[PDB]
């Protein structure tokens, strides 16, 4: 099989004795990318002010969040230092080498600055066809308000400011597409219902005003236990993080 084809081997020395993927020297093993994809990373983070929400905030949504195992399309700007120099996390880098998947994701919503209550819904039959989130007053009514019968969780910030949920796989097909394009008209159906786990909506439930500094919502994510990165195609070409901010100014 050509991908691993090694003809006419010329090997001067014997192989190097094993450490069981680090288990001999350190106390743990490192043999599967799936394990690393289960270590949380930043999915999206933003600040929301009263001006971003509807004039009359009738317990409306704060964030409409599309759920992709390969993460969102990052926007590196002066306001987002992480995406600019850290770029994409490990999970989007891992995901890029595989075509398909079939599992769920585990999220962690951290809301700071708000004394009210937060509601979270999962819309598996309504996933976005764009790789960017929708904020506040730009969210359509169909999603801006709590829908019935969807799997949900409602949490008071007074008890805990961190929400922990696991989003399931509810798709009509065999696989979900990894690394999908937002420019897709020839296969809209694939992009619409065979790509994302369904939008996750994060809203507020109370009359408390938002501080002038605003509230900050940080969504971390990771792969669930039933998740699988399925068919290994090539890796795409990469960029180097050390080529964002140069070492010509070692401290900056």
């Amino acid at each position: 099989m050509e991908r691993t084809f090694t003809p006419n081997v010329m090997q001067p020395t014997p192989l190097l004795p094993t450490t069981n993927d680090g288990r001999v020297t350190f106390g743990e093993a490192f043999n599967d990318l799936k394990d690393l994809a289960r270590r949380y990373q930043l999915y999206w983070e933003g600040t929301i002010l009263e001006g971003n929400l509807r004039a009359i905030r009738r317990n409306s949504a704060l964030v409409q969040l599309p759920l992709y195992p390969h993460g969102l399309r990052i926007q590196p700007d002066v306001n987002n230092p992480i995406w600019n120099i850290m770029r994409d996390g490990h999970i989007p880098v891992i995901s890029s080498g595989f075509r398909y998947f079939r599992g769920g994701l585990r999220l962690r919503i951290v809301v700071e600055g708000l004394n009210s209550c937060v509601w979270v819904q999962h819309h598996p039959d309504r996933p976005s066809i764009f790789s960017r989130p929708i904020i506040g007053r730009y969210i359509a009514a169909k999603d801006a308000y709590r829908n019935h019968a969807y799997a949900a969780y409602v949490q008071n910030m007074s008890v805990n400011r961190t929400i922990e949920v696991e989003v399931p796989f509810y798709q009509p097909g065999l696989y979900g597409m990894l690394n999908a394009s937002d420019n897709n008209t020839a296969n809209s159906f694939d992009r619409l219902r065979f790509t994302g786990l369904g939008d996750l909506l994060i809203g507020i439930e109370g009359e408390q005003p938002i501080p002038k500094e605003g509230i900050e919502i940080s969504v971390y994510y990771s792969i669930a236990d039933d998740f699988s990165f399925n068919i290994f195609c090539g890796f795409p070409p990469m960029v180097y993080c050390d080529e964002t901010y140069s070492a010509a100014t070692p401290d900056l």
């Binding site: 819309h123 598996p124 039959d125 309504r126 359509a140 009514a141 169909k142 999603d143 829908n147 019935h148 019968a149 969807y150 799997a151 509810y170 009509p172 097909g173 065999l174 219902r193």
Partner: protein, 363 residues
């Protein structure tokens, strides 16, 4: 669930006239619709209320399915015929996988898919358990939530063709009514809880978004239904604000976020008007001459001025209004949109004041 969705629900009945020398012929399409657990809205008994929501009599399989996101399995279509031992015919009912309309549908094509042939010889009931033929395992529901949230289309089509035309005698009714009913097959399943596609009819009130509402400019109302020369030689109905000519009611500012193929529905008070429409070629579309309430409208643009064309508050009026709006959208010839516009008979009563309209759009 299986015990619920197994119960048959009634669909829109239809008449089958043996004396219709035009329709009662071999190859004629009697009845057809897409196959999915929720029935198409126009194949279900309805009750409309001015300024309120329509009530639909959904079958048990349709109600339950609107609670879940996915669906799959066979569907039992029971057909009940109002006949007696004199009547006779043969029908060919077919299940066409991967087709959503009858645009390319003929008997001589339908026979090339899964189908059954029924004989009406002293038989009044039979069931056509249709298959489930899909390129995937679960199929997304058709109707979803507000603003068509999470909606999609049906995967297949069912069609009833006339093989051997209906025969009666002189001492026997020449019309045979057919009542279609629907239930889930033994192999039917429902996947995933979602926002109900439906709501109860205990309260059919609804508050349309104020931001989408449009009306006539000040001084351009009250309005009435009438004619003017520069619009098909004043044979078609439009809304005027006076009897001097070029006094055609103008619409206020129409927001740019409104879809181009969208027609409109009256929200507040309205008017009654006498109109008609002759049967259109290749369709069963006609409006008999009668007094109808104004329920729908289509926007006719002439330069920087926007005018409104009236449509009757009737399920067929809803369809013709939508089709017309679509024709204006593709810049169809003005001469070819003419047969889809209600006729002018006589000026109607005026409105108490301005009339408010809200944007809507159908499949």
């Amino acid at each position: 669930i299986s015990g619920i969705i197994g119960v048959y629900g009634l669909l829109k009945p239809f008449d089958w006239n043996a004396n219709d020398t035009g329709r009662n012929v071999g190859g004629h399409l009697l009845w057809s619709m897409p196959v999915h657990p929720q029935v198409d809205k126009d194949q279900v008994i309805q009750v409309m209320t001015q300024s309120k929501l329509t009530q639909y009599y959904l079958p048990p399989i349709s109600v339950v399915s609107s609670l879940y996101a996915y669906t799959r399995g066979s569907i039992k279509y029971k057909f009940l015929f109002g006949n007696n031992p004199r009547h006779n015919a043969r029908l060919l009912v077919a299940y066409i996988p991967g087709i959503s309309s009858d645009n390319r549908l003929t008997l001589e094509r339908a026979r090339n898919s899964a189908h059954v042939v029924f004989s009406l010889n002293e038989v009044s009931e039979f069931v056509f358990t249709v298959p489930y033929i899909t390129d995937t395992m679960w199929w997304p529901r058709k109707y979803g939530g507000p603003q068509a949230a999470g909606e999609f289309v049906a995967p297949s089509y069912i069609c009833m063709f006339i093989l051997n035309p209906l025969v009666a005698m002189e001492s026997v009714p020449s019309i045979v009514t057919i009542v279609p009913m629907i239930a889930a097959g033994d192999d039917f399943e429902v996947a995933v809880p979602a926002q109900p596609a439906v709501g109860l009819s205990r309260n059919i009130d609804v508050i349309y978004p104020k931001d989408s509402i449009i009306s006539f400019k000040s001084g351009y109302f009250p309005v009435y239904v009438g004619s003017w020369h520069s619009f098909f030689d004043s044979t078609k109905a439009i809304l005027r604000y006076g009897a001097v000519s070029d006094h055609i009611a103008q619409l206020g500012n129409i927001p740019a976020n409104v879809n181009r193929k969208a027609f409109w529905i009256v929200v507040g008070d309205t008017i009654k008007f006498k109109t008609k429409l002759d049967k259109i070629n290749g369709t069963e579309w006609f409006i008999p001459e009668g007094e109808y309430t104004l329920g729908y409208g289509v926007v006719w643009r002439d330069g920087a001025y926007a005018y409104m064309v009236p449509y009757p508050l009737t399920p067929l009026g809803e369809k013709i209004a939508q089709y017309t709006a679509s024709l204006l959208a593709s810049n169809t010839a003005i001469s070819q949109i003419r047969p889809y516009i209600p006729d002018y008979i006589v000026d109607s009563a005026a409105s108490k004041d301005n009339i408010l309209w809200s944007p809507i759009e159908d499949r």
